[PDB]
Design a protein around this ligand. Sequence first.
Ligand SMILES: [K+]
Ligand SMILES: [K+]
Ligand SMILES: [K+]
Ligand SMILES: [K+]
Ligand SMILES: [K+]
Ligand SMILES: [Mg+2]
Ligand SMILES: [Mg+2]
Ligand SMILES: [Mg+2]
Ligand SMILES: [Mg+2]
Ligand SMILES: [Mg+2]
Ligand SMILES: [Mg+2]
Ligand SMILES: [Mg+2]
Ligand SMILES: [Mg+2]
Ligand SMILES: [Mg+2]
Ligand SMILES: [Mg+2]
Ligand SMILES: [Mg+2]
Ligand SMILES: [Mg+2]
Ligand SMILES: [Mg+2]
Ligand SMILES: [Mg+2]
Ligand SMILES: [Mg+2]
Ligand SMILES: [Mg+2]
Ligand SMILES: [Mg+2]
Ligand SMILES: [Mg+2]
Ligand SMILES: [Mg+2]
Ligand SMILES: [Mg+2]
Ligand SMILES: [Mg+2]
Ligand SMILES: [Mg+2]
Ligand SMILES: [Mg+2]
Ligand SMILES: [Mg+2]
Ligand SMILES: [Mg+2]
Ligand SMILES: [Mg+2]
Ligand SMILES: [Mg+2]
Ligand SMILES: [Mg+2]
Ligand SMILES: [Mg+2]
Ligand SMILES: [Mg+2]
Ligand SMILES: [Mg+2]
Ligand SMILES: [Mg+2]
Ligand SMILES: [Mg+2]
Ligand SMILES: [Mg+2]
Ligand SMILES: [Mg+2]
Ligand SMILES: [Mg+2]
Ligand code: NA
Ligand code: NA
Ligand code: NA
Lengths: 97, 77
Amino acid sequence: KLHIKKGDTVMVISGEDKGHSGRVLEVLVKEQRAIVEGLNMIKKHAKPSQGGIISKEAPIHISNLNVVDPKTGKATRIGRRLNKLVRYAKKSGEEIK
Amino acid sequence: SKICQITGKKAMVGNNVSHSKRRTKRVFDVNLFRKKFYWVEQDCWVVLRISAAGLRLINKIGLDAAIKRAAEKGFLN
RNA sequence: CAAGAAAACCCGCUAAGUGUGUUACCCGUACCGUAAACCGACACAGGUGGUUGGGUUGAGUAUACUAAGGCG
RNA sequence: AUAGUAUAUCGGUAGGGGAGCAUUCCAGCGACGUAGAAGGGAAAAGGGCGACUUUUUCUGGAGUUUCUGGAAAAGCAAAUGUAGGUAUAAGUAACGAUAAAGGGGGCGAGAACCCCCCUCGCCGAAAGACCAAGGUUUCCUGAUCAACGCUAAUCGGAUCAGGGUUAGUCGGGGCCUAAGGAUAAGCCGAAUGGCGAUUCCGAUGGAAGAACCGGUUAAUAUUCCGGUACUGAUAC
RNA sequence: UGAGGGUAGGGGUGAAAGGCUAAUCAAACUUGGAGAUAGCUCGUACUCCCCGAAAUGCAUUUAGGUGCAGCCUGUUGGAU
RNA sequence: UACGAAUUGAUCCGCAGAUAUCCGAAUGGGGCAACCCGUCAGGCCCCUGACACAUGAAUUCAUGAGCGAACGCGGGGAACUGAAACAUCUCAUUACCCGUAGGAGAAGAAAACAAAAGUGAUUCCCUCAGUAGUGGCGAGCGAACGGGGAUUAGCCCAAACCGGCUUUGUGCAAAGUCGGGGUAAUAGGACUUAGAUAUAGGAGAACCUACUGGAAAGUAUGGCCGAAGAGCAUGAAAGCUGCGUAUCCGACAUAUCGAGCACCUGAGUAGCGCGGGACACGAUCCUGUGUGAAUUGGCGGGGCCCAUCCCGUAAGGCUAAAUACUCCCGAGAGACCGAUAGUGAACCAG
Ligand SMILES: [K+]
Ligand SMILES: [K+]
Ligand SMILES: [K+]
Ligand SMILES: [K+]
Ligand SMILES: [K+]
Ligand SMILES: [Mg+2]
Ligand SMILES: [Mg+2]
Ligand SMILES: [Mg+2]
Ligand SMILES: [Mg+2]
Ligand SMILES: [Mg+2]
Ligand SMILES: [Mg+2]
Ligand SMILES: [Mg+2]
Ligand SMILES: [Mg+2]
Ligand SMILES: [Mg+2]
Ligand SMILES: [Mg+2]
Ligand SMILES: [Mg+2]
Ligand SMILES: [Mg+2]
Ligand SMILES: [Mg+2]
Ligand SMILES: [Mg+2]
Ligand SMILES: [Mg+2]
Ligand SMILES: [Mg+2]
Ligand SMILES: [Mg+2]
Ligand SMILES: [Mg+2]
Ligand SMILES: [Mg+2]
Ligand SMILES: [Mg+2]
Ligand SMILES: [Mg+2]
Ligand SMILES: [Mg+2]
Ligand SMILES: [Mg+2]
Ligand SMILES: [Mg+2]
Ligand SMILES: [Mg+2]
Ligand SMILES: [Mg+2]
Ligand SMILES: [Mg+2]
Ligand SMILES: [Mg+2]
Ligand SMILES: [Mg+2]
Ligand SMILES: [Mg+2]
Ligand SMILES: [Mg+2]
Ligand SMILES: [Mg+2]
Ligand SMILES: [Mg+2]
Ligand SMILES: [Mg+2]
Ligand SMILES: [Mg+2]
Ligand SMILES: [Mg+2]
Ligand code: NA
Ligand code: NA
Ligand code: NA
């Protein structure tokens, strides 16, 4: 189990991109990292194979990402309840996604 | 196997001891020989590899009882 | 004279009882091998069983010079 | 050291005694650190005396430490002492048979050495050709010149990739037995085991089943192709 | 001279040299007993302070070893 | 890089199944391990499938073989070394070689100790005690009794005699075999459990603002949780970010948990001579060789031996616990190491 997954909308809580939200693009389970859309861009130097510097999202360690509250816009911790199990936001109590 | 078939006797290990008390390893062997026997009850002959002590038992309780005693204790096999 | 393997294949004996067509499975097969490729720690002046080994000269497979081929 | 400031005494090997410093970790009371810890470079200052300690500054980029007590893997200059690194001899010995080289073209950044051609020289009962043992891809081709090659290298038995070994008869094996080995029935023997046939295994030998010449590939050739032969099975 | 066998460590083999038995032989090699034993040689690492010898006697399968005495030092009690 | 799988539930975890080439105990025969060659029954077509076929010990059937830590029990068994030389002695009933069990093994229920006072199976710990002894009386070696503990537990045959059945000799008698009788030391006997645990899992509290900074988890405020302030990770040192921790809840499988009477009471045995071995030990126990009793008024022991007294019943057997060990599995720890250290091996390691 992980507290985030693909398609989730999450807010960064630590790092240089703290205070920024975004959608989760890919989850690297073994390394415990995920790509969030529009955050943590990098300038990769690619040879033609036309070449040039290109932009891409670098993964953020998942412990710095929290699922945004359904009702309010702030990041909250989550839990699972039988109501199979399902995620829900600890700040408001509503089911998540 | 150099074992008596009536008594089970086998060679034992000991020492030679000289007058200066030098001790060297030796073997005490069995007075073991092969002998043919007439078996009155079975009207046949058998050849046994026995010690002189086994022959003494044969000449006290008889051949037939000796083979029965020897087979119970596991000496004839 | 120092007196020069064995068993089977292939032929006997009794006892006991030509023609045509199709087809021929398995493994090896490169390359080095009087050597830089093997045995010597080395691309080491050593060692390494068998066969062949042209022409002139010669008793000769010795010696000298040469072909094919191989080398500096 | 004696007396409580005075008197005496203070060269030292083997050796006896006293008092301390540093190192690693632990307990307790406490401190320091990204506003820069440990470590490393430089400088300055301290200590009855010393083992050592403190401060400043550069590097460094995350740990460190006072005091009291506790426990030790608790301190190097030498053992023809060990590991790793780097010197000296020294740009010295040497570059592995005195069979030998010269020129013109070529590819190329680059040529004494590589390719082609002309000349020269060496072996030729061999330094040529075919097998066995052993090796195991070194064979051919393209790319590459870092390392390897006792120099350089565009070259190589080097690196990487691709390719290449074709059997009714050849050599083996299938069959047979020798030395020897393993055994059967038996024999011997603390154990482990040692012996023991006409039996089986085991070639370096014996087989009543039989092929030779030529040509083609960059690399195979009694094997592929051509010609001309031979030997077993099998069905009509 | 080729191939394949056989003899194994107080054993083998030797036209005999104590030769040879995997560059090892008056007793191979490997592992273990095992850190054998070595009255022998070499070596033994921070600091300051106080004191400070012996190389003689006796005995010893002893003589370059050791035991006891003699001579140093700590603590303690006596004066000598 | 390329193509796919998966909310009609992929991957992943636990449990049970399917498949499982060749060698190797290797087992159809051979063999230079991973190869060659067969007989037999079936089915395809010079070949190829799919069966069976070793040996040895029991009754076709059942069994075994081989491998592998240490601990146990057996069979054999050194030397260096110490004795400041060395031979008795020591090292040592060690190293080592071989055989063979079990979760432990061995021992074990008095032919025992003791000393007129008593204790009663075995094993292991603390003492007794470096004692009594033993010893070229050298170097050395070295008990037991008694006391205090751990743990505790006791049983079964043979024989007298009775019955049956088979065999044998001649109804009798003997043997063998099953049933009944019987088991001693003060002598005795005969006759006259289904739940739990294990191997997957589920839930699991609580933080904001400012500064420094590349990045806060740091520092300063102000909150909150605590049966949770163990820890690891996260761009620096986090009870409140993540995985977790305290606590609670869970298994379709599979695994585990009377008088008399003299009839009997173990034979090549006890004991003995010769030669050895083990006992602390250079009377007691074992035996290679040669011999050899008695029967309850018997027999054995109490450190030569005799007498008396005391203790006990050999020559049949079985038994848990308290003890020994770690190839391994799970959970933990360390005033232990931190890459020339610590295992030879943190990587690629025999
Ligand atoms: K430290
Ligand atoms: K080329
Ligand atoms: K020897
Ligand atoms: K086989
Ligand atoms: K009975
Ligand atoms: Mg034959
Ligand atoms: Mg060829
Ligand atoms: Mg050369
Ligand atoms: Mg020759
Ligand atoms: Mg010839
Ligand atoms: Mg000629
Ligand atoms: Mg010549
Ligand atoms: Mg002075
Ligand atoms: Mg002085
Ligand atoms: Mg020197
Ligand atoms: Mg010079
Ligand atoms: Mg010169
Ligand atoms: Mg030289
Ligand atoms: Mg020179
Ligand atoms: Mg040269
Ligand atoms: Mg040649
Ligand atoms: Mg080539
Ligand atoms: Mg070069
Ligand atoms: Mg090449
Ligand atoms: Mg042939
Ligand atoms: Mg044969
Ligand atoms: Mg060729
Ligand atoms: Mg040809
Ligand atoms: Mg001589
Ligand atoms: Mg030699
Ligand atoms: Mg010797
Ligand atoms: Mg020893
Ligand atoms: Mg030593
Ligand atoms: Mg002085
Ligand atoms: Mg001396
Ligand atoms: Mg002295
Ligand atoms: Mg000695
Ligand atoms: Mg077992
Ligand atoms: Mg037990
Ligand atoms: Mg007495
Ligand atoms: Mg290491
Ligand atoms: Na600084
Ligand atoms: Na040092
Ligand atoms: Na959970």
